[PDB]
Amino acid sequence: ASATRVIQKLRNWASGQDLQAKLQLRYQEIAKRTQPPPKLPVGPSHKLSNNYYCTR
Amino acid sequence: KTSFGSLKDEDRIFTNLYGRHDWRLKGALRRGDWYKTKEILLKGPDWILGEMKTSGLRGRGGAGFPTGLKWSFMNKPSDGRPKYLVVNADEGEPGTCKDREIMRHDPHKLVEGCLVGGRAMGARAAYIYIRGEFYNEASNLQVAIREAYEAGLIGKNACGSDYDFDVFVVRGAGAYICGEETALIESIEGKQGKPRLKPPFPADVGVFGCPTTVANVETVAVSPTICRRGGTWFAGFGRERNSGTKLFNISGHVNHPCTVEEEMSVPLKELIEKHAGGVTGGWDNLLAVIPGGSSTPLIPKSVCETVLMDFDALVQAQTGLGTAAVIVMDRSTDIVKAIARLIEFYKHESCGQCTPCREGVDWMNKVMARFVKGDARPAEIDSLWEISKQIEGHTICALGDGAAWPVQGLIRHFRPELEDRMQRFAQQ
Ligand SMILES: Cc1cc2nc3c(=O)[nH]c(=O)nc-3n(C[C@H](O)[C@H](O)[C@H](O)COP(=O)(O)O)c2cc1C
Ligand code: SF4
């Protein structure tokens, strides 16, 4: 992120293509590390009725 | 042979169902009992069962099965054991008062009919099991039996007849389950009122391991005058498959609740309107009726105007007749509360030996209370239907059926009220 705009130019020329947009490192574009709690869903066979294990 | 429910007093086979003339012998003898009983007995046993089979007399207890066939299951001789006759009077199902009202006010009909049933079958004696709460009624009955023994109608020479008989009065201790054929038998034997599996049948091995056929009060009380007046006359009234007179107990939300003897296959509306005058607020104020006591589902008023009080009709209406104890609701009462109360009853009165009625009745009790309060959601209604269907034919005795049927009657005819109570509780 810090490449003083002329070394950025040097590396983008020697490489062949802009890499300041596609960087090997991670600064702030990542999913953060403490998150909200989820509510995971519940699959079928939780029907509460018309659901007998002999049928499925 | 069409639209016949009303009749006169020559046919009233319970001439003193209101205690208005006399219950003792002197006063009952006038009303046509103990008249030709020697001739009846010495006519023959098979003649009696023929009169029964021609009368088309179905069991006037809960489960209506044709007598004659039932009583003929121990016409065979005895292979080294005595035979017995258990008269059932544990009138514990809600709404049912008829057996009380005959127990008092006409015991001698019962006594002579029980004798007649024994000699039609074979029986050393009889055991009249009667509810423990019916103390005074049982004492009236014991007094009647004592008068009979004194007058010489029972004992070493039962009205002569070359046939000896006794009549005992066993006294229960307050449990609805002891009305079943087999819980009754075990209670007489001196144990808990826990039914047996059926097989074995009481006619091969019953009370004290001896043959028996259990019978209800009126089922036998109408036997002697049937023999005295023929199966043609008893079968002339009522439809061809379910015939005869019928005691009708009426309760709840009607101006004049009463017990009535009436013609079988009478419409429910004719019955309610003639006797026990119109329901509170009239027919339009009717909401639902239970024709049996409590082991029969509901009726929604859509098939109250076009239904006959019969076994076959109510079976066609996805319902059933039991002891015919009509109960009425009149739009001014929470119905789910009533059925929840019935299931609370069926929980209290369970014996508990077989798992479905032990647990699932308590399930349904809790869930129906939760439905009363509205603390459930409609995905549980069909779950509870499934619970009912699990309980139905998975039991030793038909108390699980009786617990499950009102549930189905409410789910079939009153589901939107459950929906409304649920959405009300959810909103609030
Ligand atoms: C839980 C339960 C309770 C019953 N209670 C009675 C009762 O109190 N009185 C009665 O006559 N039958 C009762 N029955 C039905 C009896 O099996 C029936 O009366 C008996 O078999 C005689 O049938 P009958 O009408 O042919 O004489 C009950 C059945 C069950 C399953
Ligand atoms: S259904 Fe209930 S009362 Fe009948 S045998 Fe089972 S547990 Fe006992």
mmCIF file with all atom_site columns, C-alpha atoms in Angstrom, chain B residues 149-219:
data_model
loop_
_atom_site.group_PDB
_atom_site.id
_atom_site.type_symbol
_atom_site.label_atom_id
_atom_site.label_alt_id
_atom_site.label_comp_id
_atom_site.label_asym_id
_atom_site.label_entity_id
_atom_site.label_seq_id
_atom_site.pdbx_PDB_ins_code
_atom_site.Cartn_x
_atom_site.Cartn_y
_atom_site.Cartn_z
_atom_site.occupancy
_atom_site.B_iso_or_equiv
_atom_site.pdbx_formal_charge
_atom_site.auth_seq_id
_atom_site.auth_comp_id
_atom_site.auth_asym_id
_atom_site.auth_atom_id
_atom_site.pdbx_PDB_model_num
ATOM 1  C CA . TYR B 1 149 ? -84.533 -64.756 48.446 1.00 0.00 ? 149 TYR B CA 1
ATOM 2  C CA . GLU B 1 150 ? -87.215 -64.556 51.136 1.00 0.00 ? 150 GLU B CA 1
ATOM 3  C CA . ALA B 1 151 ? -90.093 -64.953 48.675 1.00 0.00 ? 151 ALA B CA 1
ATOM 4  C CA . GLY B 1 152 ? -88.367 -67.956 47.099 1.00 0.00 ? 152 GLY B CA 1
ATOM 5  C CA . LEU B 1 153 ? -87.449 -66.644 43.654 1.00 0.00 ? 153 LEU B CA 1
ATOM 6  C CA . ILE B 1 154 ? -83.707 -67.349 43.997 1.00 0.00 ? 154 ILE B CA 1
ATOM 7  C CA . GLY B 1 155 ? -81.622 -69.970 45.761 1.00 0.00 ? 155 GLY B CA 1
ATOM 8  C CA . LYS B 1 156 ? -82.082 -73.699 46.158 1.00 0.00 ? 156 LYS B CA 1
ATOM 9  C CA . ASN B 1 157 ? -85.169 -73.638 43.882 1.00 0.00 ? 157 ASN B CA 1
ATOM 10 C CA . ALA B 1 158 ? -85.210 -70.483 41.759 1.00 0.00 ? 158 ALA B CA 1
ATOM 11 C CA . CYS B 1 159 ? -88.950 -70.092 41.159 1.00 0.00 ? 159 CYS B CA 1
ATOM 12 C CA . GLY B 1 160 ? -88.889 -73.871 41.142 1.00 0.00 ? 160 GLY B CA 1
ATOM 13 C CA . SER B 1 161 ? -87.389 -74.671 37.757 1.00 0.00 ? 161 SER B CA 1
ATOM 14 C CA . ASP B 1 162 ? -85.095 -77.484 38.986 1.00 0.00 ? 162 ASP B CA 1
ATOM 15 C CA . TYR B 1 163 ? -82.298 -74.898 38.756 1.00 0.00 ? 163 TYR B CA 1
ATOM 16 C CA . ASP B 1 164 ? -80.414 -73.249 41.611 1.00 0.00 ? 164 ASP B CA 1
ATOM 17 C CA . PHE B 1 165 ? -79.063 -69.709 41.452 1.00 0.00 ? 165 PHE B CA 1
ATOM 18 C CA . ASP B 1 166 ? -77.516 -67.025 43.639 1.00 0.00 ? 166 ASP B CA 1
ATOM 19 C CA . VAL B 1 167 ? -77.005 -63.307 43.024 1.00 0.00 ? 167 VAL B CA 1
ATOM 20 C CA . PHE B 1 168 ? -74.079 -61.446 44.588 1.00 0.00 ? 168 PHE B CA 1
ATOM 21 C CA . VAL B 1 169 ? -73.421 -57.719 44.754 1.00 0.00 ? 169 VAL B CA 1
ATOM 22 C CA . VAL B 1 170 ? -69.774 -56.741 44.462 1.00 0.00 ? 170 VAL B CA 1
ATOM 23 C CA . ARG B 1 171 ? -68.990 -53.129 45.315 1.00 0.00 ? 171 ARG B CA 1
ATOM 24 C CA . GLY B 1 172 ? -66.410 -51.113 43.419 1.00 0.00 ? 172 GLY B CA 1
ATOM 25 C CA . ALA B 1 173 ? -64.034 -48.448 44.652 1.00 0.00 ? 173 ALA B CA 1
ATOM 26 C CA . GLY B 1 174 ? -64.218 -45.563 42.205 1.00 0.00 ? 174 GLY B CA 1
ATOM 27 C CA . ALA B 1 175 ? -62.404 -46.193 38.942 1.00 0.00 ? 175 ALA B CA 1
ATOM 28 C CA . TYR B 1 176 ? -63.905 -45.719 35.486 1.00 0.00 ? 176 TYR B CA 1
ATOM 29 C CA . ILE B 1 177 ? -61.619 -48.369 34.010 1.00 0.00 ? 177 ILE B CA 1
ATOM 30 C CA . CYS B 1 178 ? -63.338 -51.032 36.104 1.00 0.00 ? 178 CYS B CA 1
ATOM 31 C CA . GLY B 1 179 ? -66.299 -50.824 33.710 1.00 0.00 ? 179 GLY B CA 1
ATOM 32 C CA . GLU B 1 180 ? -64.310 -52.703 31.077 1.00 0.00 ? 180 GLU B CA 1
ATOM 33 C CA . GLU B 1 181 ? -65.141 -56.385 30.660 1.00 0.00 ? 181 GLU B CA 1
ATOM 34 C CA . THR B 1 182 ? -61.806 -57.542 32.043 1.00 0.00 ? 182 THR B CA 1
ATOM 35 C CA . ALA B 1 183 ? -60.768 -54.855 34.511 1.00 0.00 ? 183 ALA B CA 1
ATOM 36 C CA . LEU B 1 184 ? -64.139 -55.526 36.124 1.00 0.00 ? 184 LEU B CA 1
ATOM 37 C CA . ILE B 1 185 ? -63.262 -59.210 36.311 1.00 0.00 ? 185 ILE B CA 1
ATOM 38 C CA . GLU B 1 186 ? -59.849 -58.624 37.864 1.00 0.00 ? 186 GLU B CA 1
ATOM 39 C CA . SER B 1 187 ? -61.360 -56.188 40.365 1.00 0.00 ? 187 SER B CA 1
ATOM 40 C CA . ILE B 1 188 ? -63.849 -58.865 41.389 1.00 0.00 ? 188 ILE B CA 1
ATOM 41 C CA . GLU B 1 189 ? -60.895 -61.247 41.638 1.00 0.00 ? 189 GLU B CA 1
ATOM 42 C CA . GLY B 1 190 ? -59.215 -58.846 44.071 1.00 0.00 ? 190 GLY B CA 1
ATOM 43 C CA . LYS B 1 191 ? -56.571 -56.963 42.127 1.00 0.00 ? 191 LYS B CA 1
ATOM 44 C CA . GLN B 1 192 ? -56.121 -53.704 40.280 1.00 0.00 ? 192 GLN B CA 1
ATOM 45 C CA . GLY B 1 193 ? -58.623 -52.831 37.582 1.00 0.00 ? 193 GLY B CA 1
ATOM 46 C CA . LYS B 1 194 ? -56.179 -53.598 34.800 1.00 0.00 ? 194 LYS B CA 1
ATOM 47 C CA . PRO B 1 195 ? -57.720 -55.105 31.635 1.00 0.00 ? 195 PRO B CA 1
ATOM 48 C CA . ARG B 1 196 ? -56.516 -58.273 29.957 1.00 0.00 ? 196 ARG B CA 1
ATOM 49 C CA . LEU B 1 197 ? -55.565 -58.754 26.353 1.00 0.00 ? 197 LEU B CA 1
ATOM 50 C CA . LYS B 1 198 ? -58.561 -60.544 24.820 1.00 0.00 ? 198 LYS B CA 1
ATOM 51 C CA . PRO B 1 199 ? -57.684 -63.280 24.004 1.00 0.00 ? 199 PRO B CA 1
ATOM 52 C CA . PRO B 1 200 ? -58.293 -65.109 26.231 1.00 0.00 ? 200 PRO B CA 1
ATOM 53 C CA . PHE B 1 201 ? -61.979 -64.447 26.065 1.00 0.00 ? 201 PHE B CA 1
ATOM 54 C CA . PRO B 1 202 ? -64.120 -64.482 29.247 1.00 0.00 ? 202 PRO B CA 1
ATOM 55 C CA . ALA B 1 203 ? -66.242 -67.336 27.881 1.00 0.00 ? 203 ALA B CA 1
ATOM 56 C CA . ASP B 1 204 ? -63.332 -69.800 27.914 1.00 0.00 ? 204 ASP B CA 1
ATOM 57 C CA . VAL B 1 205 ? -61.511 -68.280 30.880 1.00 0.00 ? 205 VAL B CA 1
ATOM 58 C CA . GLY B 1 206 ? -62.930 -65.348 32.845 1.00 0.00 ? 206 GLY B CA 1
ATOM 59 C CA . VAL B 1 207 ? -63.533 -64.542 36.488 1.00 0.00 ? 207 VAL B CA 1
ATOM 60 C CA . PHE B 1 208 ? -61.729 -66.959 38.798 1.00 0.00 ? 208 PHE B CA 1
ATOM 61 C CA . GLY B 1 209 ? -60.548 -68.600 35.592 1.00 0.00 ? 209 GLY B CA 1
ATOM 62 C CA . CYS B 1 210 ? -64.133 -69.634 34.912 1.00 0.00 ? 210 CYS B CA 1
ATOM 63 C CA . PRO B 1 211 ? -66.404 -68.892 31.937 1.00 0.00 ? 211 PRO B CA 1
ATOM 64 C CA . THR B 1 212 ? -68.276 -65.606 32.046 1.00 0.00 ? 212 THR B CA 1
ATOM 65 C CA . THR B 1 213 ? -70.136 -63.197 29.816 1.00 0.00 ? 213 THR B CA 1
ATOM 66 C CA . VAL B 1 214 ? -70.158 -59.648 31.124 1.00 0.00 ? 214 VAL B CA 1
ATOM 67 C CA . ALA B 1 215 ? -73.312 -57.644 30.479 1.00 0.00 ? 215 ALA B CA 1
ATOM 68 C CA . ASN B 1 216 ? -74.695 -54.195 31.210 1.00 0.00 ? 216 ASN B CA 1
ATOM 69 C CA . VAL B 1 217 ? -77.698 -53.488 33.430 1.00 0.00 ? 217 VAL B CA 1
ATOM 70 C CA . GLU B 1 218 ? -80.366 -52.808 30.826 1.00 0.00 ? 218 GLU B CA 1
ATOM 71 C CA . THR B 1 219 ? -78.935 -55.460 28.481 1.00 0.00 ? 219 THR B CA 1
#
